[PDB]
Design an enzyme around this catalytic site. Sequence first.
Site, PDB file in Angstrom:
ATOM      1  N   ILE A 270       0.838  -1.203   0.000  1.00 38.04           N
ATOM      2  CA  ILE A 270       0.000   0.000   0.000  1.00 38.04           C
ATOM      3  C   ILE A 270       0.877   1.258   0.000  1.00 38.04           C
ATOM      4  O   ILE A 270       0.693   2.143  -0.839  1.00 38.04           O
ATOM      5  CB  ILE A 270      -0.968  -0.004   1.197  1.00 38.04           C
ATOM      6  CG1 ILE A 270      -2.054  -1.080   0.992  1.00 38.04           C
ATOM      7  CG2 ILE A 270      -1.607   1.390   1.381  1.00 38.04           C
ATOM      8  CD1 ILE A 270      -3.047  -1.206   2.189  1.00 38.04           C
ATOM      9  N   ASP A 281      -5.774   2.016   6.421  1.00 36.44           N
ATOM     10  CA  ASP A 281      -5.132   1.553   7.651  1.00 36.44           C
ATOM     11  C   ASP A 281      -6.136   0.596   8.305  1.00 36.44           C
ATOM     12  O   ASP A 281      -7.277   0.978   8.562  1.00 36.44           O
ATOM     13  CB  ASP A 281      -4.835   2.744   8.574  1.00 36.44           C
ATOM     14  CG  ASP A 281      -4.613   2.334  10.033  1.00 36.44           C
ATOM     15  OD1 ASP A 281      -3.929   1.309  10.258  1.00 36.44           O
ATOM     16  OD2 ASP A 281      -5.105   3.032  10.952  1.00 36.44           O
ATOM     17  N   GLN A 298      -0.105  -4.616  10.564  1.00 35.28           N
ATOM     18  CA  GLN A 298      -0.258  -3.573   9.521  1.00 35.28           C
ATOM     19  C   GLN A 298      -0.387  -2.142  10.062  1.00 35.28           C
ATOM     20  O   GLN A 298       0.358  -1.232   9.632  1.00 35.28           O
ATOM     21  CB  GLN A 298      -1.492  -3.872   8.636  1.00 35.28           C
ATOM     22  CG  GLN A 298      -1.519  -3.132   7.257  1.00 35.28           C
ATOM     23  CD  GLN A 298      -2.521  -1.981   7.166  1.00 35.28           C
ATOM     24  OE1 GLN A 298      -2.919  -1.415   8.174  1.00 35.28           O
ATOM     25  NE2 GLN A 298      -2.917  -1.622   5.937  1.00 35.28           N
ATOM     26  N   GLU A 299      -1.260  -1.952  11.041  1.00 33.92           N
ATOM     27  CA  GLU A 299      -1.509  -0.599  11.551  1.00 33.92           C
ATOM     28  C   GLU A 299      -0.305  -0.069  12.307  1.00 33.92           C
ATOM     29  O   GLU A 299       0.116   1.068  12.114  1.00 33.92           O
ATOM     30  CB  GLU A 299      -2.719  -0.533  12.458  1.00 33.92           C
ATOM     31  CG  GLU A 299      -2.877   0.869  13.073  1.00 33.92           C
ATOM     32  CD  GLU A 299      -4.201   1.092  13.743  1.00 33.92           C
ATOM     33  OE1 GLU A 299      -4.571   0.276  14.586  1.00 33.92           O
ATOM     34  OE2 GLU A 299      -4.864   2.112  13.446  1.00 33.92           O
ATOM     35  N   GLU A 300       0.228  -0.903  13.206  1.00 28.32           N
ATOM     36  CA  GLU A 300       1.315  -0.458  14.037  1.00 28.32           C
ATOM     37  C   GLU A 300       2.518  -0.123  13.182  1.00 28.32           C
ATOM     38  O   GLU A 300       3.204   0.866  13.432  1.00 28.32           O
ATOM     39  CB  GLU A 300       1.656  -1.503  15.082  1.00 28.32           C
ATOM     40  CG  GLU A 300       0.585  -1.686  16.185  1.00 28.32           C
ATOM     41  CD  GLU A 300      -0.454  -2.732  15.897  1.00 28.32           C
ATOM     42  OE1 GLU A 300      -0.447  -3.294  14.782  1.00 28.32           O
ATOM     43  OE2 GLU A 300      -1.285  -3.022  16.810  1.00 28.32           O
ATOM     44  N   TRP A 414      -8.248  -6.526   4.825  1.00 24.05           N
ATOM     45  CA  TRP A 414      -8.768  -5.795   5.987  1.00 24.05           C
ATOM     46  C   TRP A 414      -9.501  -6.704   7.001  1.00 24.05           C
ATOM     47  O   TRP A 414     -10.486  -7.360   6.658  1.00 24.05           O
ATOM     48  CB  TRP A 414      -9.731  -4.745   5.443  1.00 24.05           C
ATOM     49  CG  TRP A 414     -10.443  -3.935   6.481  1.00 24.05           C
ATOM     50  CD1 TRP A 414      -9.892  -3.358   7.583  1.00 24.05           C
ATOM     51  CD2 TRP A 414     -11.833  -3.570   6.473  1.00 24.05           C
ATOM     52  NE1 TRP A 414     -10.849  -2.637   8.264  1.00 24.05           N
ATOM     53  CE2 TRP A 414     -12.058  -2.775   7.618  1.00 24.05           C
ATOM     54  CE3 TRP A 414     -12.909  -3.854   5.621  1.00 24.05           C
ATOM     55  CZ2 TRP A 414     -13.313  -2.247   7.921  1.00 24.05           C
ATOM     56  CZ3 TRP A 414     -14.174  -3.341   5.927  1.00 24.05           C
ATOM     57  CH2 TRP A 414     -14.361  -2.535   7.064  1.00 24.05           C
ATOM     58  N   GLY A 415      -9.030  -6.736   8.243  1.00 24.07           N
ATOM     59  CA  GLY A 415      -9.691  -7.520   9.307  1.00 24.07           C
ATOM     60  C   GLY A 415      -9.374  -9.010   9.350  1.00 24.07           C
ATOM     61  O   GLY A 415      -9.960  -9.757  10.136  1.00 24.07           O
ATOM     62  N   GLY A 417      -6.609 -12.293   9.726  1.00 20.34           N
ATOM     63  CA  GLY A 417      -5.663 -12.476  10.851  1.00 20.34           C
ATOM     64  C   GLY A 417      -6.314 -12.485  12.228  1.00 20.34           C
ATOM     65  O   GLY A 417      -7.339 -13.122  12.421  1.00 20.34           O
TER      66      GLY A 417
END
Length: 507
Positions: A270, A281, A298-300, A414-415, A417
């Site tokens: 991304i 995110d 991913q976010e962290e 997305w979402g 995991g």
Amino acid sequence: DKKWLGTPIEEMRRMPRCGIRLPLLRPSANHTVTIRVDLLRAGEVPKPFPTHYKDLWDNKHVKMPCSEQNLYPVTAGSRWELIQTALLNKFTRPQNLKDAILKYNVAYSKKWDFTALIDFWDKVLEEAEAQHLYQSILPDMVKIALCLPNICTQPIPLLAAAMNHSITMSQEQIASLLANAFFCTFPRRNAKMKSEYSSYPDINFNRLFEGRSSRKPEKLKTLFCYFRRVTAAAPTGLVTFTRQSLEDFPEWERCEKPLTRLHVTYEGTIEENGQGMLQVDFANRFVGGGVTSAGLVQEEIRFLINPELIISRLFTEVLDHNECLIITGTEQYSEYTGYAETYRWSRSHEDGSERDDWQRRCTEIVAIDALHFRRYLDQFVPEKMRRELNKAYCGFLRPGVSSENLSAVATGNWGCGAFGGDARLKALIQILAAAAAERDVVYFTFGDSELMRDIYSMHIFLTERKLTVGDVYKLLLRYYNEECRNCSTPGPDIKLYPFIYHAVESC
């Protein structure tokens, strides 16, 4: 096996070229602007507005460490004076830094562990690296932290639940705020049984310093790369944080919109290949997730390599189901390899993104939080599917902007995991949300070539049959009814995509 499928990425819309002419930047009832717009100039450090510090210590604004109302029971004493006394001592050993932070956090002297900080300084860093840390980086970080009242002169409003509001501040302002967070100076943000800020993420960095995870040195290397860069040479740009809430959500079943275009690929990321695109995110409802503690997915990772994102935690209340946070202008300062327990800081990164007319980097990131499913089949419940569709729609929609001025959405699994999302369902949900918001989709599957093929194949099938968003949503309802509603086992008999192909082909 081709590495990407669908529409060529060259045909997708990107910023800055696709975008509307920005209006003049100005403060307004719904837009806080903490700098002098009349003086904003490329290559120049923005001037704070107002010139002298103005304090608000109340339930609608950030409680600043430098407030005269930031007191400690001694008789009430000034905690800002105490922070100044504590931090202006030379550090030569990590205990020096722990003891400093604790001087104005006495209530946490037994609760806050500094093992990771001590181990980073003493057991990971080489002598000359440690020396540079305590002789240069940490004293520079102190000085920009203690400049807070001269830099952040305007009260910062909380982006509270249900507010539709924007804050635009300078990268230099953010650096001072983040140095304060490192030194754990934000009051009222620490107590486990706190009330006012219980619905806000953690901002003070104390949990970065705890424990013996092998990833803490990598997080610290990543953050110190940023702090070194921004204390050595002041950043000149701006960043905008926008909380968005929508009232009216689509009647999905009735939506007559066609699907939009898709590029899907198992290579790329991304952040690199989605330049100028709306970058998703994969957020926690408390934005940034465990960036300041133990998360490293991913976010962290995005919050670590673009640390200006971290300051959203200062002022962003937990996201409700109809809300997102849109951040424009954050800069990438680090490159990395790996993911979670293989994450490593690689090197400093020179961000080459163009800036827009408000001196913001042309990088737009939206935090949308997926649901956490306790059981796999929970996500096919219509209420839950509708919830995810509406969350993504809110993240992608830009009220008042027409389709041709909207970049493609750059997204992925997305979402999936730890949150238990099904990738094939979540890909369809994003595709439907993007269609309703009239944006094309660029989808990164991060090494999963089978998933790339499966998403492409479904998207082109639905496209060639001219099924609308409503047609596809009705198919998801049928899948739940026929394969999930009265299923009493953990997984359905037939998978979603095979069900859709059969339902459509035999109709």
